[PDB]
Amino acid sequence: GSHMEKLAKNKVISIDAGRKYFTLNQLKRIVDKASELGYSDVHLLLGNDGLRFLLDDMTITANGKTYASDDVKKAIIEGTKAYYDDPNGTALTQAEVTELIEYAKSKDIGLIPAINSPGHMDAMLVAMEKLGIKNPQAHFDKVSKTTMDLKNEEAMNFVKALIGKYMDFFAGKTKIFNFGTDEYANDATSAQGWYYLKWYQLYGKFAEYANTLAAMAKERGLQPMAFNDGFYYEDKDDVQFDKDVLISYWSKGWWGYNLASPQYLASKGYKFLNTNGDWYYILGQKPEDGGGFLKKAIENTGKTPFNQLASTKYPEVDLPTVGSMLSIWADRPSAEYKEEEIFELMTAFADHNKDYFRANYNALREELAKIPTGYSKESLEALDAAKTALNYNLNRNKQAELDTLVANLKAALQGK
Ligand SMILES: C[C@H]1N[C@@H]2[C@@H](O)[C@H](O)[C@@H](CO)O[C@@H]2S1
Ligand SMILES: [Mg+2]
Ligand SMILES: [Mg+2]
Ligand SMILES: [Mg+2]
Ligand SMILES: [Mg+2]
């Protein structure tokens, strides 16, 4: 819409730091580049197959017992290493993530944490076995290595408590919490998890789980977010879902995976974070592999409109979104993370959408930091003038405009 509305939208870079380890410094550099290019948020998966975040206190109370903090940490490290024993590291610490959140805040970048369940939770499943919780895995064509059995109360109680502890930490630090719910038991059903849930009359139980996670988020002052997969599958509403969840919409699925259309979810009142699959890059994916390789993602930042929801033609279909999310995935977590690839993709998305993205405010912030905490009244009026002239509302089309403003502040400070 208007200048104001476009800049009000979220522009998100998503990083799969669940499957693959990222150091605090790597994530800080991603925050840096996000701020420079005019993004508003970094979406950070911390639970996604691997579980790569440990709180200082991981004491868990569930099932009428307590699991000691040291036992929980040990079990999670085991689970994550079992998924993929990343040579770069295992888990981020509470101090590291606190530091990341604060660093992002200083640059007007939000953090959006994701801890995935009941799918994409390999590490949690093994962790639960280590803690004496037998058979946490769903069991269809085979025993799943990724997905929790909704009928296992002991495991369900534990995971809810675990997610609550993470939510407790993010409460008052982040606006949004993404509980995921994508791709239920894909590994055990030939990617037909929702069909299998329905077959076994467990889709109502899946809704109950998602509805609970959504209430948990809201209760702790977090906007709940989830991927679209499990919501109103096949545009049916015999089973109801919480209407306050922000939907990260990425795909309407494929043959035999009949996800609800964005039109149908819009009719149910959902708002969307446009997480179009067209923009995906999977680390190490090459043109010969098909799917989300870098050249395709980069090309799509131009071809797929900012507001275009997957499975729809924009503006012919124009559904309300709060903004858009470009996603970096680590399906094969041993693939090398090459920061410049991610930066080029991030830059392409911003360059194709200069009206949505902010200008680069880093030079300005550095310059304001030089303001001395007994000068001429003439030299002061000028510093006040240049300061008053600063414009914090500029988009990426107006970098030269901003640079001039900053230069005037530089001169006034040096003409002190
Ligand atoms: C919601 C996300 N679910 C899947 C994700 O785990 C994959 O990494 C990605 C790339 O294969 O594709 C989809 S998007
Ligand atoms: Mg088996
Ligand atoms: Mg309904
Ligand atoms: Mg995307
Ligand atoms: Mg690497």
From Swiss-Prot:
Q: Where is this region: Catalytic domain 2?
A: 5-416
Localization annotation:
Secreted, Cell wall
Lineage top rank: taxon: Bacteria
Recorded family membership: Belongs to the glycosyl hydrolase 20 family.
Task: Report what the protein is called.
Answer: Beta-N-acetylhexosaminidase
List the source organism.
Answer: Streptococcus pneumoniae serotype 4 (strain ATCC BAA-334 / TIGR4)
Give me the gene this protein comes from.
strH
